[PDB]
Amino acid sequence: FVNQHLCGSHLVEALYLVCGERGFFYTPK
Amino acid sequence: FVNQHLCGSHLVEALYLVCGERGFFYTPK
Amino acid sequence: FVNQHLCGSHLVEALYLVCGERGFFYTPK
Amino acid sequence: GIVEQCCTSICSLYQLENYCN
Amino acid sequence: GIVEQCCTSICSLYQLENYCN
Amino acid sequence: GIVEQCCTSICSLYQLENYCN
Ligand SMILES: *C(=O)CC[C@H](NC(=O)CCCCCCCCCCCCCCC(=O)O)C(=O)O
Ligand SMILES: *C(=O)CC[C@H](NC(=O)CCCCCCCCCCCCCCC(=O)O)C(=O)O
Ligand SMILES: *C(=O)CC[C@H](NC(=O)CCCCCCCCCCCCCCC(=O)O)C(=O)O
Ligand SMILES: [Cl-]
Ligand SMILES: [Zn+2]
């Protein structure tokens, strides 16, 4: 089950863009 | 159903490369 | 079945990072 | 978490913004 | 459309080129 | 191969390193 792993890759790219100079936290529960 | 959403991300990258200086249209029906 | 195709895209990015100046081989069996 | 929220349905930019610092 | 054509089977570079300007 | 090994389960960085030159 690498679907979540690959989804997560896209999520971090999207958060980089969204969050900007605020930056973000990435915490897989 | 984020599978189409993530597929689309890869499609746009591929069209950037394919289309070159022509550019492209991305229209999810 | 584009799941393998899209997985492969991520694998090559990961191998670029892992392998560094050694580089890598990508051979879909 | 973000993986439960956003890998089981598409998260808008507004919903992704909940995970900014 | 491109999502129907190319997310249900792998599109070659030739088939992707149908979506260039 | 790498697709069989690493698209059916998550490959660690150590396991990916088997495919370096
Ligand atoms: C494990 O998978 C999680 C189990 C459980 N469930 C949760 O859903 C997490 C809830 C706490 C996270 C913070 C919630 C933020 C405020 C929720 C109000 C809804 C309004 C906005 C909707 C949205 O999130 O987009 C757990 O206890 O963690
Ligand atoms: C909604 O999902 C689409 C419904 C319906 N079906 C279609 O397939 C779209 C057909 C029109 C798009 C332009 C078709 C281009 C020429 C098709 C000839 C086939 C030769 C090349 C094959 C290829 O596309 O790779 C609709 O009416 O839109
Ligand atoms: C076609 O899909 C493959 C069929 C068949 N099966 C294989 O699994 C490939 C085996 C040969 C590849 C090299 C194997 C490396 C050493 C394996 C020892 C296991 C220790 C480490 C585990 C790991 O790989 O992470 C075939 O004959 O090719
Ligand atoms: Cl993906
Ligand atoms: Zn992907």
Side-chain angles (χ1 to χ4, degrees):
Chain A
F1 191 62
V2 318
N3 252 92
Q4 251 173 37
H5 190 70
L6 297 180
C7 180
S9 160
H10 296 277
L11 280 175
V12 301
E13 286 189 277
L15 288 174
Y16 179 70
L17 274 164
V18 171
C19 299
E21 55 187 37
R22 293 154 84 180
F24 64 91
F25 51 102
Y26 183 73
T27 337
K29 109 170 219 176
Chain B
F1 191 62
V2 318
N3 252 92
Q4 251 173 37
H5 190 70
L6 297 180
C7 180
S9 160
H10 296 277
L11 280 175
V12 301
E13 286 189 277
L15 288 174
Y16 179 70
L17 274 164
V18 171
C19 299
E21 55 187 37
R22 293 154 84 180
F24 64 91
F25 51 102
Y26 183 73
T27 337
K29 109 170 219 176
Chain C
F1 191 62
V2 318
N3 252 92
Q4 251 173 37
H5 190 70
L6 297 180
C7 180
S9 160
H10 296 277
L11 280 175
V12 301
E13 286 189 277
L15 288 174
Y16 179 70
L17 274 164
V18 171
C19 299
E21 55 187 37
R22 293 154 84 180
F24 64 91
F25 51 102
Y26 183 73
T27 337
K29 109 170 219 176
Chain D
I2 196 175
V3 170
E4 316 95 77
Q5 210 209 129
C6 298
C7 299
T8 51
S9 28
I10 297 171
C11 276
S12 72
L13 292 185
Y14 303 95
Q15 293 173 278
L16 293 164
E17 194 250 326
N18 291 325
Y19 302 99
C20 308
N21 299 325
Chain E
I2 196 175
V3 170
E4 316 95 77
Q5 210 209 129
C6 298
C7 299
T8 51
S9 28
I10 297 171
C11 276
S12 72
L13 292 185
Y14 303 95
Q15 293 173 278
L16 293 164
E17 194 250 326
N18 291 324
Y19 302 99
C20 308
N21 299 325
Chain F
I2 196 175
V3 170
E4 316 95 77
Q5 210 209 129
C6 298
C7 299
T8 51
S9 28
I10 297 171
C11 276
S12 72
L13 292 185
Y14 303 95
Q15 293 173 278
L16 293 164
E17 194 250 326
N18 291 324
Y19 302 99
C20 308
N21 299 325

